[PDB]
Amino acid sequence: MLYHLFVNNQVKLQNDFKPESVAAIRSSAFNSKGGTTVFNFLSAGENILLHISIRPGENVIVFNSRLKNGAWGPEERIPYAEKFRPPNPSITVIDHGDRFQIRFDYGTSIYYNKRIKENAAAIAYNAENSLFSSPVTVDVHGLLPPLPPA
Amino acid sequence: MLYHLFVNNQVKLQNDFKPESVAAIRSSAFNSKGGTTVFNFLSAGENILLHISIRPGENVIVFNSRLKNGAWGPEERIPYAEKFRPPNPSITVIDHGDRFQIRFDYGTSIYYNKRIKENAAAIAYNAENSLFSSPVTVDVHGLLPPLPPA
Amino acid sequence: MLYHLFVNNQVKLQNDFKPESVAAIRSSAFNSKGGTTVFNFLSAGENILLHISIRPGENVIVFNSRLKNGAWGPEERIPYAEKFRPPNPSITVIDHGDRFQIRFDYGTSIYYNKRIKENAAAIAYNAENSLFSSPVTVDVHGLLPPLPPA
Amino acid sequence: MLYHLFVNNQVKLQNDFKPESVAAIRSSAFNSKGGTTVFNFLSAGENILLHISIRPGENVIVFNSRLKNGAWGPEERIPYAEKFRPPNPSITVIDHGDRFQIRFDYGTSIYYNKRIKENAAAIAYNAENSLFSSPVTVDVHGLLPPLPPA
Ligand SMILES: CC(=O)N[C@@H]1[C@@H](O[C@@H]2O[C@H](CO)[C@H](O)[C@H](O)[C@H]2O)[C@@H](O)[C@H](CO)O[C@H]1O
Ligand SMILES: CC(=O)N[C@@H]1[C@@H](O[C@@H]2O[C@H](CO)[C@H](O)[C@H](O)[C@H]2O)[C@@H](O)[C@H](CO)O[C@H]1O
Ligand SMILES: CC(=O)N[C@@H]1[C@@H](O[C@@H]2O[C@H](CO)[C@H](O)[C@H](O)[C@H]2O)[C@@H](O)[C@H](CO)O[C@H]1O
Ligand SMILES: CC(=O)N[C@@H]1[C@@H](O[C@@H]2O[C@H](CO)[C@H](O)[C@H](O)[C@H]2O)[C@@H](O)[C@H](CO)O[C@H]1O
After folding, report:
1. Quick one: CATH architecture of D1-150?
2. Coil, helix or strand at residue A137
3. Whole-angstrom Cα distance, residue D3 to residue D14?
């Protein structure tokens, strides 16, 4: 399923993002002078199951969760440098049941253990000066599709 | 290369659309009651090398070409019905040197013998009431990519 | 559909190779010091609809056709040097209805007009000492499948 | 990287199968009467990091590990039913660092937690009379490849 996720807006998944689900987010730009950019996987109740805060002007990428209302739990950060590849950077999220696997364009996958027991019913994209394009292309799979040779 | 082509707008290709190039256009919604929807592969001088006029109201899809300052050539026509797959219909275009191959979701491909000897420097998307989404995802390749087993 | 076409053998297709069909042949090796290597697409009556004779020594790649009991027709050739990429060289045959497109690893593809009005029922492979592996992997599609972003 | 893995034989990997690596194993046939079929991921020391024994008879698929000069540890087994899709059944193995993800054609992924802290340098295939074709097509990736929209 293909969705066009607009900045500071969101898309409702026609199907729950759950174990086996694969979400491939791709950007057609990558704005160097851009700042903090966020992607959130939302439960039906709109709790932030997976929060991805890309902070260029701070060389860090923060991963967290929190009830829509609640405060933020412990952060799980990793360096920002050498993660994305211009001009078409991307972010791939996979639901492995007990944790999320997140991959950028370079480096090893980041594994984020689930903290909130709910499937994602939507994906939000927030940014005041996004590092990416608006919208960003988003393909969501129910399962891992047959892979090409390269 | 990923581009986001908005309705009644266009996109400048990083490299020219030439022999071997593949363009994969994908929509995110498919509006069953949308009107005439067009896609134009434009040369540097704005010549319409390939014109794809999807006309649901006339149940036909028209292919043609014309120099910016010239007139349309004869029309290439094929039935519209049962060509697109909702909710994410697609259109693939491939430059085979002497002619373009156009594939939708179902049916046989369409071949349209080039009439202007030029490469494409951009692709336009036009519609007052479009069948597809704005924008449409467009992946441009320099050659056929590794094919998946499925 | 995946097949393992062994050298000096052939594989019977579960469905006819016809317009829109895609045969992606891949080798696990490139025995550069090899010799003449051939791939043939045969119809039910056993006519050779498409003959591809790769000759490293002569430094050319011959394309031809011939009926079951007939002599070869005129040849259509191209230089062989560097048309294949090690360690996994590939050949991709696509039926465009009136002609086949033959894709190697390098250089613009080659088109061959159909001489025999039949669909192929088997793909053959012959060689005294192949330039490729035995077998070669062959994925046959009824139509071009969705293309990955790259 | 493509390899043709023959039954009762193995293929020496170009690069180490390590975290991020993906191995797509595909067969051209499905021998319904076939007996126990095994695939082993081996360390340079020839220790069996991942052992996968498919037993149609006992309706089970066994996963284990052992040292070259060793006996089998406790078995992790799952039902054989609803895993393979003939005539081209597959098996995808992915190294997630602490564990291997294992996918067949049907059902949810299987996770086998690593027992031997070594990267695999080879992949073996053995059986008396295989359930799968000989050889099987194996595409090994250093990291997940770009995904087709569908
Ligand atoms: C340093 C700063 O100015 N603010 C930090 C906060 O950052 C927020 O982090 C959450 C996720 O943890 C989210 O990304 C939000 O958009 C950020 O502003 C946070 O780390 C804490 C309090 O939440 O304070 C500062 O560390
Ligand atoms: C009916 C009408 O107003 N115009 C018809 C022509 O339509 C144009 O067709 C070109 C491509 O050939 C292009 O799509 C343009 O936007 C259309 O207005 C044409 O279809 C026919 C053929 O002679 O003539 C006009 O009736
Ligand atoms: C060089 C040689 O020994 N024979 C040449 C011919 O080769 C045959 O070509 C047919 C297809 O055209 C087929 O490949 C057969 O197996 C080949 O032996 C032919 O290529 C040329 C004609 O230019 O004549 C011979 O030199
Ligand atoms: C003993 C025998 O001939 N077959 C079965 C055993 O097979 C071995 O099991 C190990 C354990 O993983 C490994 O698969 C080895 O390659 C096999 O030969 C064994 O699976 C079971 C008891 O665990 O007994 C026999 O059914």
Report:
1. Sandwich (2.60)
2. strand
3. 10
Report the separation in Å between the CA atom of A62 and the middle of ligand 1, taken as the mean of its atom positions.
9
Structure-derived torsion over alpha carbons of residues C116, C122, C126, C132, reported in degrees to the nearest 10: 110
CB contact residues (below 8 A), chain D span 32-61, against chain A: none
Q: What is the 3-state secondary structure (H, E, C) of D48-102?
A: EEEEEEEECCCCEEEEEEECCCCCCCCCEEEECCCCCCCCCCEEEEEECCCEEEE
Tokens read off for B116 = 């202007």
Which amino acid, residue B7? V
D139 touches chain A (CB under 8 A): yes
* B97 touches B19 (CB < 8 A): yes
In angstroms, the separation between the Cα of residue D12 and the nearest Cα of chain C is 12
Mutation test residue for ligand 4: of D38, D72, D76, D125, the one with most atoms within 8 Å of CB: D72
Looking at the complex, does the CB of residue C22 fall below 8 Å from at least one CB of chain B? Answer: yes
Cα B141 from Cα B23, distance rounded (Å): 6
**Considering every ligand atom, which ligand is closest to the CA of C63?**
3
Query: Touching check for D110 and chain A: CB below 8 Å?
Result: no
Q: Residue C6 to residues C14, D27, D43: CA-CA distances in angstroms?
A: 17, 14, 30
**3-state DSSP of chain B:** CEEEECCCEEEEEEEEECCCCEEEEECCCCCCCCCCEEEEEECCCCCEEEEEEEEHHHCEEEEEEECCCCCCCCCEEEECCCCCCCCCCEEEEEECCCEEEEECCCCCCEEEECCCCCCEEEEEEECCCCCCCCCEEEEEECCCCCCCCC
Q: What is the rounded distance in angstroms from the CA atom of residue C93 to the CA atom of residue D17? A: 32
What does each C-alpha distance from B86 to A143, B74, B89, B93 come to in angstroms? 20, 30, 5, 19
| CA nearest to C28, candidates B18, A121, D3 | D3
- Closest CA in chain D for residue C148: D148
C72 lines ligand 3 (CB under 6 A): yes
Q: Do C97 and B103 touch (CB under 8 A)?
A: no
* D137 DSSP assignment: E
Contact C122, C100 (CB under 8 A): no
Reference B55, options B43, B39, B41, B72; nearest CA is B39
B146 and chain D: CB distance < 8 Å anywhere?
yes
Please name the residue ranges forming H helices in A10-139: none
Q: Given CB atoms, is A26 within the 8 Å cutoff of chain C?
A: yes
User: What is d(CA D86, CA D26) in angstroms, rounded to the nearest whole number?
Assistant: 11
Q: Phi and psi (nearest 5°) for C148?
A: -65, 160
For every residue of C52-104, DSSP letters joined together read: EEEETTTTEEEEEEE-TTPPP---EEEE-TT-S-SSS-EEEEEE-SSEEEEE-
Distance of CA B149 to the CA centre of its chain: 26
Rounded Cα distance between C92 and C50, Å, is 13
CA D133 to ligand 4 center in whole angstroms: 22
Interatomic CA distance for residues C25 and B126, integer angstroms: 39
Atom of ligand 1 lying closest to residue A53 CA: 14
User: How close is the Cα of D42 to the center of ligand 4, in Å?
Assistant: 18
Distance CA B103, CA A71 (A): 50
Residue B57: phi, psi to the nearest 5?
-70, -15
CB pair distance less than 8 Å for C148 and A149? no
Tokens standing for residue A14: 């026609």
Q: C107 vs chain A: nearest CA distance in angstroms? A: 19
